[PDB]
């Protein structure tokens, strides 16, 4: 009554987008360490029960197409959906290999009116990326 | 009828406007913390309990080490945005 129904055949799809190398036009450098992140993330979400697929060094058109086609699949036997983005970022935007695309446009494909087989089901997005260039100096 | 924006959860590695830190030899801070809590509690804790413990590990266990003194001894706190309507267990 207070938990999401998890009595489905599959836990769900989990898409990992692992962007490490970027075009010289973007100005962004290599994200060393993100391969250890994606491999550790792949094992932990696989262990949860997700069907994990990892895509590497994606464009902004590929990232939009991946999430739009995942939005268009049949999720009737899935309990939830998960997406993990590992890339460079600025505020409200995630970096492809060839530039930036808005995070809102990536996630809007899974709205209630645009993906009916995930209606009333949790859609989770984990975003490892910068959101600006401010630093947290901390306090003792 | 139900809102088209319902049942979304965004687990951001940092707060709006701020940097996200990544160790090249052992991975990003947020992912390091997320996969230690998940390996230990992914199947017995609710998603907000998991992510709250990740907020604590990122905030307490990580501090920047840079040669550049403008980037030295910096901290990070992650950011959870929840439009969920129920509790979520992976169990």
């Amino acid at each position: 009554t207070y938990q999401y129904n998890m009595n489905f055949e599959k836990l769900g799809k989990c898409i990992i987008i692992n962007n490490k190398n970027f075009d010289k036009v973007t100005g962004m450098g290599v994200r060393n360490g993100t391969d250890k992140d994606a491999e550790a993330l792949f094992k932990c979400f696989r262990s949860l029960g997700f069907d994990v697929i990892v895509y590497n060094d994606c464009s902004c058109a590929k990232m939009q197409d991946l999430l739009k086609k995942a939005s268009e699949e049949d999720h009737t036997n899935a309990a939830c959906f998960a997406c993990i983005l590992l890339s460079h970022g600025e505020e409200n935007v995630i970096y492809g290999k060839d530039g930036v695309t808005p995070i809102k446009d990536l996630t809007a494909h899974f709205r209630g009116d645009r993906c009916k087989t995930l209606l009333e089901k949790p859609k989770l997005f984990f975003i490892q990326a910068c959101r600006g260039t401010e630093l947290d100096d901390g306090i003792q | 009828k139900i809102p088209v924006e319902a049942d979304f959860l965004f687990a951001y590695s940092t707060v709006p406007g701020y940097y996200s830190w990544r160790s090249p030899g052992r991975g990003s801070w947020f992912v390091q913390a997320l996969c230690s809590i998940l390996e230990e509690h992914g199947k017995d804790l609710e998603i907000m309990q998991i992510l709250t413990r990740v907020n604590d590990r990122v905030a307490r266990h990580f501090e920047s080490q840079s040669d550049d003194p403008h980037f030295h001894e910096k901290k990070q706190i992650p950011c959870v945005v929840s439009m969920l309507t129920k509790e979520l267990y992976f169990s």
Binding site: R31, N32 | Y19, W21, P24, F71
Partner: peptide, 4 residues
């Protein structure tokens, strides 16, 4: 330690 690098930033994203």
């Amino acid at each position: 330690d690098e930033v994203x």
